[model samples]
Target: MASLAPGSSRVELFKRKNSTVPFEESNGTIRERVVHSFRIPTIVNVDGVMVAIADARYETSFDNSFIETAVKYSVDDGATWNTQIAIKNSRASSVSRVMDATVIVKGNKLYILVGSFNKTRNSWTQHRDGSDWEPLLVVGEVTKSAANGKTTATISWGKPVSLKPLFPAEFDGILTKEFIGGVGAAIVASNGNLVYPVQIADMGGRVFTKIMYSEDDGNTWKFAEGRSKFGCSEPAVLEWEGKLIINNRVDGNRRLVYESSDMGKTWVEALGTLSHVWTNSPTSNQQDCQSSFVAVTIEGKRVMLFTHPLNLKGRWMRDRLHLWMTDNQRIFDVGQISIGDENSGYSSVLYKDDKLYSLHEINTNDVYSLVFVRLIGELQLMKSVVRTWKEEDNHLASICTPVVPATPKGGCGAAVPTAGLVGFLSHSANGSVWEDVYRCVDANVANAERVPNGLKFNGVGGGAVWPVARQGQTRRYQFANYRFTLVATVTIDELPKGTSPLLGAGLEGPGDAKLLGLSYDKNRQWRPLYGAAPASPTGSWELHKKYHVVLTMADRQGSVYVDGQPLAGSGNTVVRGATLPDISHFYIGGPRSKGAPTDSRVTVTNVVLYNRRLNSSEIRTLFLSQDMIGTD
Candidate 1:
C-alpha cells in the first residue's frame, strides 16, 4: 500500500566521492573563505538536454577561485555530464565574486540570471554596513549546439544592471549597490510575468528578502508593494494555483512562507513557520542553506516541494536533503521526502513526468562537486530533527514546563503596600506587594527595612512586591517617540522560568512589554528572555549568582546586556516589530493566576528607569554612567 504521509515515499541514493582539494588556505574563515568550486549548483532542461549550471572556482587557492562561472549539460538524461566555463572575474573585482545563478529554458531560448557582487573583496563584510556596495543582476542566454538527442550550451551575457535606485532599493539605504536580487530560477508565471528573488541589507550589515519582477521578459524590473514588511532572505519562488508563492530562510533556521497575488507586488500574508522542516550546515545553522522550490501534480492534485538539508547529526549539513510538500496550496502540510542521504548543499529542483531531479552541491570533505539524482529505490531510515505540532506542544509542556509560569510574564503581585517609588524599591525588609490582575496600578510593596544592596520581597508564607512609577507622570514614562531603559537587580529563589521578564513597558490591554527575565531552560543554564524568546541562553545566570540586567529599546529596535556582554546568541537577533507605547501598569513578581505569592518569594533591588535609549557601548557602562550599584 502506498502511503500519503510525508517522508512516506521511497527514497534511495548513491554518492560518489572526490579526493581532490580544489583550493585550500592555511589562514581562513567563514565569511571570508575562498569561493570553492561547484558553488550554487543549478540545473535546467535546455530543450531536450539536461543542463546544470553553477559558480565554479578556478585553479588554486591563490587563484581567482569562485571568480568563475560554468555550465554542464547532458543528453542522455544526465547519464554523462559535460562542462564549460562561461566567464571569470578577470578584473578581480571581488573574491568569490559571482554569487548565485539560475537557468530557465523557454522555447529553446535558454536564459540564466546571475547574481554578482560589484565591490571587490566584498562577498561578505561582517559588521560592515553596505550602501555603495553594488550588487548586480546580469542576464545571459545560451547559444545552443544541438543534434540527434545530443546538446551543449554557450552563454552570451550582456552588461550587468543595478537596483540601486528602484522602488525599494533606496528606501532603507539597505539595498545593495549592485549584486543582490537573485535566488533560484527567475520563474515565469502563468500570466507571463518574470520574477526573481532579491535581498536588502540592514545598517548592522544583516540581510532581508525582497523581490524584483519583470513583465516584458528581463528588460525592466520593479519592486513589490504592500502594507506589511516581510523579513527573510535567500528566497526560492514558484507559481502554484495561479498565484506566486515564495519561501525564505530565517536566522532561526526555519522556512518563512509568503504569497503574492499581484505579481510579487503585494504579499497576502506571512503564512507561519513550516513545521517538521529542519536544516543544518557547518558554516552556521543560520538557515539550512538556500532551498529549491517546485510544484508537482501528484495523483492529479497539486503539491509543493521545498528542499533543504535535513542533517540527522544535528551538527552539520551532511545528513540528507529533505523536500517537504504542502497540500493546502497556501499553508504547507507536514510531509517530506528524503531525496538522498548524503552531504548536500543548496538544491535546484526539476519535476517532469512526475519524476524529481535535484541538482545539488556535494562537499567531498575537500572539493565541492556537482551531481544529479533521480529517485530509484528504497527509503533511508533517517531521524528527523522535528516533532509534529501536536507532539511538539506535548513536549513544550513537558519541557517549557509542568510547574513553571504558563505565560512568560504572568501574575502581578499586589500583595504588598508601599510609598512613592522613583529610583530603587526603598530597602524593604519584607517584600509585600498587593495581589491583583496586570492592568492595575494601585499595587505596592511593603514589609520592613534594608539589606547591603536593596529591598527583599518577603514571601514568609505567600507574598509579592509591585513597585511602579505613577501613571500621572506621563511626560516621563510616555514621552512621544522616545525609547527608555529598565535596570534592576532581581534575586530569585523559585522564579518559574530562568528565561523570563521581570518588568517591561506595556500593561494588560496594549503592549511594548519588553520582557527582562531570569529563567532556567532545559539546557540546564539560567539566562534572560529579552522579549518572548530567550535573549541568548548563553552563559550561566546561575540561580544564586548576583548580576546586573539592562534592557533598552525604542521603535522596533532594542538592546540587551547581562552582567557585561552580549548574551552570546544570534548577533543579528533583536526585537522585530515596533515596541509597545507606554508603561500604563507594570507588574513585579509572578502571576496571581499562578503561585505569585509563592513565586514572588525573593528580592528585587536597585531598579531605575531611564528617559533615553542607550546604545550597545552605553549599555555596558549604564551603571557606571548612572553611578549606582544594586546595593551601594
Candidate 2:
C-alpha cells in the first residue's frame, strides 16, 4: 500500500508513462505528438492534502513555448498522487502560455500566480496581445472527505484574475515600458496578509525583486515600496519573527538576503546570515539559480528549510539536489534528495504534520517531470543537526567569560577574549589545503612549502586562497559584513622587490579588482591599501623578523596594526575596501593583480578572523599571548 508515513520514500507526483503530449497537426486533426517538458515545481499543503504544481511545456522547453499550469494532489501525505489537472491549459486555436506557477495554501484555498505570455513574447517583452505580459492569479477551493480509512480531496479552480491592472499608477511607466513576472510562492503573513514575490524591471533594464501584498484576502493588491538590488530575481520570501525576509537570486556567486520589518516599507541587506547558500568558485559563471526557502517549526523551535542544487560546478550543472535546514545563524545540510548530471532544476518544499515533503523538476535530454517525495529519513537527520547545533551553542555561551576591565585605548595590557572569533586557519597542510580548525572554509594552498603550523610563500606563484563565501564544515567562517578583524602571525623572510600584497581579497566588482591589503614595499615600509586608495608607509620591517600583522575594517573605514600598536597614522588610517559581498576570496601572499604573483618569502601562522572589530586593548592582549584560537 502507498503511504507518506515516517519511512516512506520517493513518489512521482506528476508521473507520465511517456514524455510526449497530444499536438495538433496542420491537417485539421490532433494526431501529431509533441514532447512536453516540465519546470518550475512548487508544493503546498492545504489542510492535510499536498498539492504539487508545475508548467507543462509543449514544443520546446523555452519559457515562451505554449505551456499550461498543471497540478496534482495527494491525500495520503505524498505516497500517491491524483490525476493531473490543467488549471490553465493552452488551446490549440488560441496559442497562449501560462508559465511559472507559484502556489500557496491558506486554510483550504489554493492561491496560484502564473505568468501569462504569448508565443511571440518571452518574460522580458510585450505580449502578442499588444500589451505587456500579465500576471494572472488563480484560486482553488479544496474539499476533503474521509470514509473507510481512505481520504480524498477535490479542488475547483476559479477564473484567472489579472493583477496587472491592480498595480498602482506609480508603476505605470515601468509596467508599460518593461516587463514583470511573479517568481516564488505567495506568503500569508502572520497578520493575515497575502504577500507574493515578484521581479520587476526598471527603465535601465535591470531586474529587481519586489513584493506585492493583498490585505483584503486577494481582493486588491499593491506593490511594496522597497526593492532589491539590480540583477536580482526569483526571490523566495517568508515571515520571520514578525519581520519579512527575502532571499533572492543575484548575478553573483552569493544570494543577497534582505529583510523588511515594516511589512515591506523598507529593506536592509542581511549579510552573514545565509552564508552557505552560495557556490564555491568565485569566478564561475554559475552566479546563481532559483531555489526554495520555507519556514517550519520542528520540536518547538522555528527553523527554515532550504532546497537547492548543491553541485560544485556552474549553475548549468543542476545536479545533486540537497536539503538544508537552519536557525538563521547556522546552516546544516540535511541530506541529498536527487543526483544526476544536469538533472535537477527549481524545487519547492512543504511541511505537513511532522513529515517533510518536496517537489522538484527532474530533467534529462530535454525531457522533464515533477517528482514529489517524502523526506522521511532526512527529517530525522535535520532534527539531529539542529539539536547538535543548539547544544553546542549553549555550551559555548555558558563557558565563555566576559571581558575584564574593558578594552583599553592605545595599550597592550591583558589577553583578549575570544568573543567574536569566527575562524582560525592554522596553515597546517591538509593535503593541498590549509585546514581551518573552526571548519568554516579551508584555504587552498598553491606552490608553497609547508612547515610546522605554517606555510611559506615564495613570492613566485605561491599563496593561500580561502573562499570565505563558502561554508565551513562546522560553521560559517566568512566575514559577513561591517566591522571585522584579521590577525596573522607572520615572519618576513625577505622583502618584496616591488609592491606585494601580503594579505588581500578579490573584489566582486567590475574588473575583479584586488582590494588593496597589507602590502610591503622594497623600502621595508608597511603599506596598507584599500582598492585604489593608498595609505602612508608605516614603520620599517627587518628580514627574518616575526611580526603580528593585524587588519581591521569598520563600515567603510579600515585600519592596520603591527605588534599590538597602530601602523602609519596616529589613529585608524587605512582606507576601506569594497563592500563585504564583493570581497569573496581572502588570500595570503597571493597575486596582487592579474597574473602578478607575490615575490617575497613570508611564513604565516595562526591566522584568526572575527566578524567584529577588536579594540586596541584586545589587539594588545592577542599580540602578548600569541596563541592559536582554540576550537573548544
Candidate 3:
C-alpha cells in the first residue's frame, strides 16, 4: 500500500487523503504513524462496474522496489461511487528482476501482456557484482473473482520469451547500440492502432523522434522513419482528418507539429505561428530532461497537456502542475492545477464520452504514486482566466501630436507645401509654414559669373537671402526658435555655363560665394563656416565630379562634414543667441538674398530631417533598423 501523510482532506473525492504530512503531528494523533492505506471508491468506476483488468505493473528490481502501476475509477457523472480492485502484482524477491504488464479487453476476456526475468543465485550475484545480465519478456492473462466484501485476482502467466532487439542483424555493425530513451504510447487512429512513438536522445542531449510499430499485438516490433532532432523527448501523437499528427514541446518556448501520412513511417513538419508561447521558464525547460503528453478532441482538435513545476521565479514556486492546450496545432492556452505542495513529472491524459481524464504522480516520496482527475470542467474555468489575462496584458495605446504650423497674418488655412523652386516664395512660404526652424545655404564656386546666372535672389540680389525678415515679422515671433541639426552631402556633377553656382540648401549670392559655405551669427552677420581649398578648375558644361561637399548647422553652431567624416575646424563654431533670419521671399534654383533665378539645374534625393539632433545610434536606428518606421 502507498503511505499517505497527515492533514489530507477527504471532502473532494478528487483530492488525495493524507497526501501531505506536517513536520509535527497533534497530540491526539498516534505517536508512531505508518499510514499504509489505499481506498477503492476513489479508484473505481461508477455503477459498481469496476474495470480491474486495466491494472498492471512492470517491476524491474529485486525485492519489488521499482514498478509501474495503473488503476481506473468513475463517478455517476456527479455524486456516487463504486468498488476498486488490484488487477496485477508481479514482484521478485532476489536477483535483477524484470517485469512488464499491460491490460487489454477483447470481448469478455481481458488480456494482459506480462514480461519478467529470473536469475539463479550465483548468476544474480555475478550480475549484481558488475557482470552483464540478461533480461526477458513474457505474456499472460488475468481472471477476476469476488467473495464477501473482498475481491481477489488470479494470474495465469506464460513462459518468458527473449525480447527481440529493435535493430536487426541486417544492419550489423552499422547500427549503434542505442537503448529506448523514452516512450509515449497512444491509441489515436480511427482503427485504434496503438502508436508508441519513442524518442532517442543521444549522449549530447539532442533527441530524434521515431516510431516502433507492433502489428501482431505487441509481440513484435518494427523500426520506422520519422524526423530526427525534432526537439526534447516524449512526443504525443494524435489522429486528425485521417492523418497522424505529432506534437512535441521544443526548446521551452514553442511546440512543433509533424504529420505522418504513412503510419509513422515518415513525417512532414507542420507550419504554425504562435506568439510568445512560454517555454524555458525557471520551472521547466521542456527541452532536454523533460517530458510531455497529448490527446485529441472528438471535434478533431489536438489538445496537448504538459506537467511541470509551476511559477519557477515568482510567488507560486513549484507548487502546482501546469496544463497547456493547443488547438489546430497553434496557440498554447495554459491552465494550472495544484497537486500537493509540489509536483513534477510525466502527465497522462485520456478522453472518453466528452470527459477528459488525467493522471500524474506527486513527488511525495521515492515510492510516490499517481493521482487521477476528471478535467473537462476544470479546463473550462482555467481557460477563462487565461483569456482575461491575455486581453489585459496585450492592450496598448499611443498619442501622436499633430504638426502645428505657426500662424501667419494670412491665416492657418493653407496646408504646408513641399519644398521646391516654384513654392519657395508663395504666400505659404511664411517661416511658420516650415516644420522646423533654422535653415542654411553654402557655396563652393570659384567665379561668381561662372556659377548658374539664372539663380534668383528672392530677398535681394548679390547676397544670401533672408525671406523671413521680408514677412514684416521679427525672429522672436515669426519662427519657432528650436534646437536643430542639419546634414548635407554635395557632389559636383557638372559646372554649367552660367554665372551662379548651385549650392547646398538653395543658392548663394556672389558676395557669399566662397569656395565652401557660410553660417549666420548672433548679430545676423555672415561667417564663413568653411571654405574649400582651390583645386584644378573643371571646364564649363563638363561633368566634373572631383569636389564633394557636405554642410550642417544646428542651434548656434555649424560644421562641414565631407565624405562621411567631420572636418578638423568643424567644431567650436558657435552662433550664440542667433535667431534664424526669416526669408520672406526664398528661391530654390536661385541665389540667396538675391531674387535672381539660377540657370543651372541640380537634383537632390534621400533627404531626412528630425526636430532634434539625433544621436549616432538613433541615426543608425532611424535609417538602418528593419521596419523601424512602422513597428511600435
Candidate 4:
C-alpha cells in the first residue's frame, strides 16, 4: 500500500507481472504472448485533497511485445487503502516497454512524466543485436471529482513528448555506434526545473551519464555543462538558498555534488562527496549500481532516499530504502530506517510541513508500503532556527522608532532609528496609520528576558522587555486601498547599556494606540507582514520597512516600489486579479493583538491619507515635507 500526503488514512495498491515468451506445441515456434497477470507497485501522494505521482514502471519481453504496469495511491496516511488500478495492455499491436513514471504538482494542477520504450526492430538471432528501441516521454494530469463516499479520478495522457536520442543517429560519420540504454528517469524539482539522469552506452562499450535541464516548464530542454562526466549516473538536482546542486551516483567512485551558480549554465566540478551506504563488489562486466530511486529537498535540506542491495558482497539481491541528509552538500550523515529483505528498491520520497513520506516497491509484488516520519527534532529544528533569523533581520523596523521631523517646518521626513531598524508605514483609507516592524535577536538570550520577573532597566532609558504578541499574526493594522500613502520609519539608538534597542510602530484602530509591531531579544527574529493580502473591495498595498519595499495592488495594475521608487509593474489584467484584502483591527508599533500592553511611546503623527494615486511630484513633496494638512 502507498501513502498519499501527511496524516492521510487511506491507501491504494497496484500490481502487474512481466510478460513471458511462449513456445508453440506442434510447430515448435516461439510466440509473443501478453502477460496480463503480473503487477508492479505504483505509488502516489494525496494531501487529503490532491494526488501527486510516486513511482511507476512496467516490464516487457526481449522483443518488447507484452507490457504490464500498476498505478496506486493513498488518501489516508497509509492506514487502509483503496483498490489498485492496473494498466494491462498499453500497446495492443506490439510490445511496449514502460520505463519510468513520475508525477508533479504545479499550483493546483497535477502532471505525471513517464518514459516508455517502443519496439523498432525484432530478430531471433541475438537478443542484444535485434533489440532496437524507440524511447518516448508521456505526460498526464489527474482530474478528480466527488461522487459518493469515494472520489472519482480520471487519468488522461496528452500528446506524447519524444525524448531526444541519447546518442545521435550519426555521430562523426559512425552510423553503427550501437546506441543502447536510456531509462530510470526520476522527475524531481517542482520549480519548473527537471533532471533526467540517463545512462548512455556506445558500441565501443563506453557508458556515460547525460544530465539535461528544462527551464520553460519542461517545454524545451538543454544539456547542463559539467554534468556529463564519464562515470556518473542517476543525477538528482536540489536547490537550497538560491543555489542549484546536483548529486549523482558514480560508477567508479562514490556519489558527489556539482554546484551551479547560474542555473546550470556552468557548474563547479565536484564540490562535495556522497557517502556510499551499500557495499557492493564491483564486477568486471557490470558495475554494482543501485536500483531506481528518487531524491527531493525536504524543509530546505536535501535528502537522498534510495534502495540498495543490503548484502552486495555475494549475489545480487534486494535491499532496504536508505535515508541520508546533507547541509553543506559535502558531508553526508547516513541512517537506515527500514529493512527490505522481502522486497525493496525503486522508491520515491516527498516532504510537506516537516514530515517525510515515501513509497517503495516491495520485492516484485504489486503491494507497496508507505513509510513516514516526523523530523521535528533533527531536521525541522535547525530549519526553524535559521528561518526565524531570516524573517527577522530581512524586514524594515527593528527596535528604535523612526526619526520624526524635529521641527514642523519642512515636509521631508527622516527616521530617528538606527540603520539596522527597518519597516514600512502607510495610512488607511479611514485616516488611520499602520506600520509593520521586524526585529532580529538571539533566541536563547531573548527567551531569558521574556520570562517573568526578569531583568528590568532603570532610569529614563531602563525598561523591562517581554513578548507582546504571538507569531504569524503580528500585523498592526490590515488595510485595503491603493489610495493610501504609507510611510515607514526606523530608529536605532545604541543605548548606553550595550543593549540592542528594538523597533516598533504606532497603529490607531478605534482609538490611537502603539502596540508592539514586532520585537526580538537575542535569539529570534520576526517579520510582521510577509504574504500577499486577500482580495479587498478597494485594493491592497504592502510595505516592507526592512527592505524598503512596497507593493500596491489595484484593479488590474500591480506596482512594486523599492526604496521609494517604482521598479516593476504587471500591466496584464489577466495576471493581476482581485488580490487586495482588508483588515479591521488596527495595530500600532507592531502586528495586531488583543491582550497586549499599549506602548504609546512609539509616537506616530503627521497623519496623511490619499484618496487617489500620488503623482511623482506629490510623492516627493510628501516625503520632503513635514506637514501637509490640506495638500492636494
Candidate 5:
C-alpha cells in the first residue's frame, strides 16, 4: 500500500489585497492596499537556506504596474520563513515595474534575473510597439550562522546590470519590440553554464520563448539562436542527460517541449516524450497555464518532476496543482499539492539535500498569496514509484511476445510497450463510482448494482461511464492515438430485445454516434461495429456462459475476440476520418442514446483498458489467467 506523510508545511510568504485603485472601507477613511498579485515563483538553496522569490504587484493583478521582486528565506526547509524583503523594488510609478524573478545557485552566491518594464499606459499590452522592457541580472551573497538552537541568514544584494546591449544585432526586430526574462527557474548546466528561459514578442505581439545563457558566471550573457513557437511563452528549463529541455506554455491546451543539446544553440521539439502533459482533450477545460519542471536523482537514476493543475472540467480554473514524475521514458502521477480548495496558480520547484520544495500562488476569493511548501512523503513515494516502473518494465519485457529491444518510450505511433495499462475498473469498495485498479481514472455507475469485483446491469437505463481524463490526471489514456484495447469479463444472463450496444465509445463529433461499439443482436449473435457500421458475426451467444470479450483497435480498423479467438469475418472494419478524434468516454451496458436496453441482467467484471492494442498471445494469457471455462 502507498504510504502517506505528515501534512506539508504551508507558510504564506506574501499576500496583498485585490485592487488596482485606492478605495475607502466602512470607516470612511481612504486607505491604500498593495494589490493582490504574487506570481512567477522561483526558489533555490543558498548557503543551505531556501530562498524563494516572486513578483509583488502594488497597483493591479494585471501585467503592467509598480511591482517588486520579493524575497523570503527559510532555514528550516519550508517549515518557517523569514520576513519578506523587496530585493528589486520598482520606481514607485504606474508604469515602472520589476517582475518575474528567477534564481540559480552558483557556488556561494545566488544569481538572479528579473524583467524590468517601463510601459506608457500602465498595461502589458499598451506599449507593445517598442522595446519597453529590460533584462536585469543581480547577485545575492548569502551567509548563514547557527547558535543557541537558532539559525539566521543574511543576504547582500548587488547592483542590477542591464543585458539589453548584449543581444545579437540579427534579433533587433524582435528584441526591439518587447522582451522579458525570468519565465521560470534558471539551471546551472553540468558544464557550469547558467541557462534561463526568456520571452520575446514580435511587433504583432506574437510571443516566442528563447534561452539566455551566461558561461562566465554572470560576467556576460547572450541570447540563444533557437526559439519556440510564435505564441509559446512562460517556459521552465531543466538539464537532463547532458542536454537542456524547456517546457513552454502555448496558446492551445497543451505544453510544448524542446530540447537543446548544444547549450541552446538550436532546439528540436521533443515529441512523444511527455505525451501525457503535452495535450488536453477537447472535453477538458482547454485553458493553458504555466508549469514547473525540475529533476532529481534517486536510486542512481534520473527522475523528473512536473507541477501543473489537474483541472479537467472547470473552465479557466487553475485549481488542484498536481505533481507528475517521469523517468524520461514512462511517466507517473506523484500526488496533489493543493488539496482542499485547489485554488492554485503558477509554481516553481526546487530539489536540494533530499528535500523537495515549491513556492506557488494561491487565490483566495480575489486576494492572492504566495505559499511555500516542502513536500513531505510525496518525495519518498516518488522514489518508490520510480523503482516500481523499472521492475514492471523488466517483467513485461520477459513476458511480451516478439521481444522488443527495450520498452517503448512514449511517442507517436509507438506501441505503449510495457506500461500501457491505463485503467482497470471494478466494483468500488466504497462510494457508487467504480474503482480503477491503477487509480488513474474511475467510472461512475448509473443504473447498475454493486457486486464483488463487478457490476450488474438492471436492464433499465443501466450503464457505467468512464472518463477519458479525470481529475488530478494529465491525460492518462491516449484517446487521440486511436490505438487501444478493451477487455471485459462478461456473463450474459438474458438476451436483449433488439440490436443494442453492450460496450460503446462516445466520440467528440457533431452527432451522438459511437466511435467503436459491440452489440448483441436479438438473434443471439455478437456484433462488432466500426464507424457505426456493423461487421459480420460468426458465433452465437450462449445463455449463462461466462466469456472473455475483447475489442482491439489498430490501423483504423477494429477486431473483436472471444476466449482468445478472433470472431470470424471480424476484420476489415474501417474507421471514419483521416485524423483520429478524441474518445470522450467509454460506456458499458448500452449505447448512450435513446435506444433499447443493451442487455438484461448482464454482469460485467474486471474491465481493463490498455493504451495500445494487445497481441494474440497477450490475449490468451489474459483469458487463461482466470480459471473459468466457457461453461459457467
Candidate 6:
C-alpha cells in the first residue's frame, strides 16, 4: 500500500448504536427499547458507496420473534454510517426473524437478499403451537438515483421475490436462506453466472446446503440439489477454475467442503476438514458460524481471503475474529491477524482499490453493534493446489479405496482392511494381503514368511512397499484423538542404507506430509517431514535388534524414541503448523521413494497405536520392558 503510511493499523470503522431511546414509542417515548443486536453482516462497495445488510435480532433468541433485517451504509468509505433501514418485521404476512442478509452491486444497480422464518403471531411466540417453521428467503433490488450521482443511494425496494418460487415446488416444505457471509452479494462468474449459497432445512430440522444459481442474471433461477456430506448447511460459494467451491457450516467442528465442476450441477467432497471456526465451549460442538471466502488478484495470483471467529469459546461465545488469506490450496498464510476479540459473528469481505472491508457484529450480546473493519493495502498471495489439505474431490475415485478381498488369516477371523479396527493385524500366511496392526493402508508382500511370532520381512522390493491410502481413511491423525502415540516393534535385518525412508503416517505422493508431521529421510535425515528449516537430524537407528520404537506427539511437540531413549540429541521437539495430508495415507516400512534401498527388511512382531501420548519409561514397558505387547 504505497498510499498507506507505515505503522498504520486496524481502525474500527463503525459501531452500532445501543445507548438510545426509540423516538417512536408506546406513548411518547420509545417503549421497551433495546440496545439492538445484529447477526450475519455482509457488505459491498457499490459504485464508491459502501452498502451493508445484517440480521437484526429482536433480542438474543435466534428463534423467530422480533428479529428482523436492516440496511446500513456509508458514503465516504465508512467515515460515516448514517443510513439505517429496517427492511423486514415480525408482523409480516407469514415470516419473522429477518436475518442472514446479503448485499451486492451489479451494473448501475444494488440488491439485497433477506431471510425470514416461521410465522409470528405477536411478540414472543411462533404463530401457532406445534406449527412448523416456514423459512423462506427472498431478494430485493435496491433502487438508486440517476443524478449523475455515483453514490448516496436508495430505500425504494422493488418487490421481494421468494426464492422458493424458483426452486422445486415439491421442496416448498423445506426452508431456504441465502447463506451468511454477505451472500446478498452474488458471486458473478467470469461467464456472468450468478451463484448464491442457499441452505435447506428439512421439516426434521436437519440442515443441508443447496445451491441457487442463475446463468441469465436474475431472469431465471434454478436451485441445485441439497448437498450433504457429513450434514452440511449455511454455505458459501466461490467461483474458481471451471468449478464452484462450496463451503458449508457443518456445526461439526470443522467446515465441510464440496465442489461442482459443472457449475453447481453436481458436487463431490473437495476438502473434508477446514479448521477455521469453533463450536461453543469445550470446543467440540458445531460453531454454526457463517464464514466468508472471496478472492482477488494479489501479487498476480488469485488468493482467497476468509473471515470468521478465530476462536469458539462455547456454543456461541463467537470470539477471536481473524482474517487470513490462502492460495485456497495450502495453509492460511501471511497477514494472519485478528480483527476482533469479542463475539464476532458472520462477516463478509469487500475489496475496493486494494483495501478490505468487513461488515460484522461486535460483542455477541443483545448489546451487539455493527462494526466495519478495514485492512488497508493490497494483500500478497501465498500457497495452494488442486489436491489439497482435505479430500481432493477429483480423487473421490480414490477417496474410498478399493475393496481388497477379505483374505482369511489362519487363526484370527480376518477379512479386509476396514475403517473399523482396534489395533491388531495377523499374517494370513503366504496370503495376498499384509494385515497391518498399526492400521496402515497397503503393505508389501513381495517376499514374506509366516511364523507364529509374525510376518518376517527379510525379503523385499524397494524396501518394504509402503502404499498410501485415500484421505477418507484417516484425516492424518486429525480425527484420531487429542494426543497420539505410535509404537512399532520390528527386528531390522540391517541398518537402513544411506538416506533411506522410514515408516511415515502421511501423504506419500504429491502433497505428502511428515511422519506424524515428522520424517527421517535422505534429505531431511532426522527432522519433521514438512518444514522450511528442519531441526538437527536425529541419530540413525541400530541394526539387527528387536527394538520397539515409539513416536509421540503431545502438548504441541513431536518426538522420536528408539526403544526407550530419545533419538540422538533431539527430544520432545516442538512442531508448529503441522500439515495434515488430505491424502492422509500411512505406511510402516517406508515413504514414497525411487532408486530406493533395494536391501531393507524387518520382521514386525507387533504394532500399537494409542490415542494419547505415553511418557518415556511407560513406553519401554511395551517391548523388552514387559508382557505389554499383546494388550491394547
Alpha-carbon TM-score of each model against the true structure? 0.50, 0.72, 0.41, 0.45, 0.72, 0.56
Candidate 5 lDDT over residue span 313-420, tens digit each? 344456777777776644567767875645777887778887777788887664567777778777777767666555544543444232233424232122223456
Residue 409's lDDT in candidate 1: 24
Range of the 10 consecutive residues with the lowest summed lDDT in candidate 1: 413-422
Q: Which ten residues in a row have the lowest lDDT in candidate 4?
A: 441-450
Assess candidate 1 and give its lDDT: 0.48
| 1-632 per-residue lDDT for model 6 (tens digits) | 11222332444433444522222332444343453565667787666666776665655544455665656666667776644444545354433555566554565455455555556544222122223233344444444455565555554455555554454534545543223222545577777766777665443445566667677767786776646553675677777667777767666556666778876768876532233222222334545667777766654456566665644465556666555555442224233234435566667778876666666666645456666666553242222221221222222112222222342323322222212122334443343455543332334554556655355654443223333333221122342323456666666654555443344455344543454533344432444442223445665545555666676655546666666676653444444555543324345554234344344455654445444567543554443432332322
In the predicted model 5, the residue pairs found to clash are none
* lDDT to native, each model: 0.48, 0.67, 0.35, 0.35, 0.68, 0.50
Error of 5 at 276 (Å): 8.0
- Rank the candidate models, highest TM-score first: 5, 2, 6, 1, 4, 3
Cα lDDT over the full model 6: 0.50
Tens-place lDDT per residue, model 4, 149-229, is 866555555555555444355333433233222223244454667555444444444445445556665677655444445
As a whole number from 0 to 100, the lDDT of residue 134 in candidate 1 is: 44
Given candidate 6, what's the lDDT at residue 422? 24
Enumerate clash totals for all models, in the order shown: 43, 3, 45, 70, 0, 11
Q: Is candidate 3 or candidate 5 better by TM-score?
A: 5
Which digits, one per residue and each the tens of the lDDT, describe model 2 over residues 1-632?
11223464675555443434334445546542434676788888888887777776765677767677766677887666664444554453244687777766788998888877654444453332325467788899989998998888898889888877775534535542333444546689998898888876654456777888889889988788888877677888989888888887765546667889988879988754553345422453464667888989986779888766754555555667777776664455666677444466788888888887788877777577777777777787677666655553454334423334654423434434456665567635744688765443567877678766678877465777766543332124444444467888887777677766677655555654555368787888888765555456778888788788887776656667888787664334233435354466677876344555456578888777767778876787677666433232
Worst 10 residues of 3 by lDDT: 419-428
Error of 2 at 450 (Å): 10
Q: Name the lDDT value of residue 401 in candidate 2.
A: 32
